[PDB]
């Protein structure tokens, strides 16, 4: 089976786990646990980081037969090619690439404040940035079924993930964008996704690592 | 003709400018100038930022007919798909996706230090992290003619750009890695590339924007 290596949190592997369940992949998780504060012991991962035959050792990683991958986006793309979840036309391909890279910039905007020791002083300023972020995503989606067009694509998993994270931090953030509320519902009720979610191996939380000031659980 | 919008520096646009040149694309640059300290006035861009039809307005952007793109990586892939500059085997596509994402993370590691007011204090530690980064690139390349196989790829433009920046910062950083030196010469030897590098267009500098501690001139 395939091995998904990541920390015992949601973070960067969540859209991957989401994809791995929708696609019917057989896979298992190599969970790395992090030591409690203050030292946040990473030695469980650091001890085998350079022992896995990874070109650029990192988390998350994925092993599939002869293929050993890092970089979360590269893994998503790998799973997508094996299981018909890329864009076909040039129009979808452009939308995929722009949204894939944009999701990561949007995720890091948010990660950078929650992981900041000064999160509480920076929290009101970031909360007022969120309406325009979400509005970009609502205008991009428009009247489409999925973000790339008619068909489910791997970027939809990225989009659901980053939107989920923002709406956990700010439960009212999608309220003036009904088309994104309908997107999240439609995604959560695919069927392999509903089954995964209302199952025990669905990792609700923590959203982030232990040293984060929010969503560390 | 295609329109490439960026600041009047090297920055994130550099690999796009090379690929545009190498593919013989018909292109013009919309160059935005930024004010001097202390304001670093951005009005030349903010004047138009939201009036260009961009889904996620940003720099660099590319306007090609009806297609209006942002995200430097999406722009590179858009150009590559027009000229078959992407991998064809599943092994090549894996090497492309991993290196594309790795090159941005490595670029960002460097950009963060140079733009940090505390640059001088951070410089010693960052210098000692460079040998390990280059070793990983060196062993990834191996004896291959290019990073993805025997066929030039857009990710080669990214790897040249990021490696060029690190060797501009630390001139001895490729010394103990001969295969990376051969990669850089062979890349510069490309006829359309050398001709672009030999004309007073070539913005090898400034690496970064005016407010950077290093590479601002
Ligand atoms: N660009 C890479 C990022 C890889 C990465 O940063 N992994 C970190 C995650 S914690 C830092 C982190 C937390 C949360 C976010 N985020 O935006 O959600 C980003 C980075 C790690 O655990 N180990 C890397 C190592 O061995 O040095 C990817 O997308 O896979
Ligand atoms: N992920 C996007 C990043 C786009 C971006 O941040 N552009 C900045 C570049 S300056 C900040 C910057 C400098 C250098 C790097 N780098 O890695 O070298 C990254 C970001 C800008 O000028 N305007 C965006 C805006 O108007 O909001 C991409 O790759 O295109
Ligand atoms: Na499908
Ligand atoms: Na404006
Ligand atoms: Na080589």
Residue numbers in the entry:
A (entry chain B), B (entry chain F): 1 to 217
Tell me, in the authors' exact words, what the paper reports.
Two domains are recognized in each monomer: the conserved N-terminal thioredoxin-like domain, containing the GSH binding site (G-site), and the less conserved C-terminal domain, containing the xenobiotic binding site (H-site).
Notably, a move of loop β2-α2 upon binding of S-p-nitrobenzyl-GSH (~4 Å) was observed, which may suggest an induced-fit mechanism to facilitate the binding of various substrates. Similarly, Trp8 and Leu13 are found to be conserved in all compared structures and are involved in the stabilization of GTB moiety in the active site via H-bonding interaction and pi-alkyl interaction with the nitro-benzyl ring, respectively. The carbonyl oxygen of Gln72 and carboxyl group of Asp106 are likely to form an H-bond with the γ-Glu amino moiety of GTB.
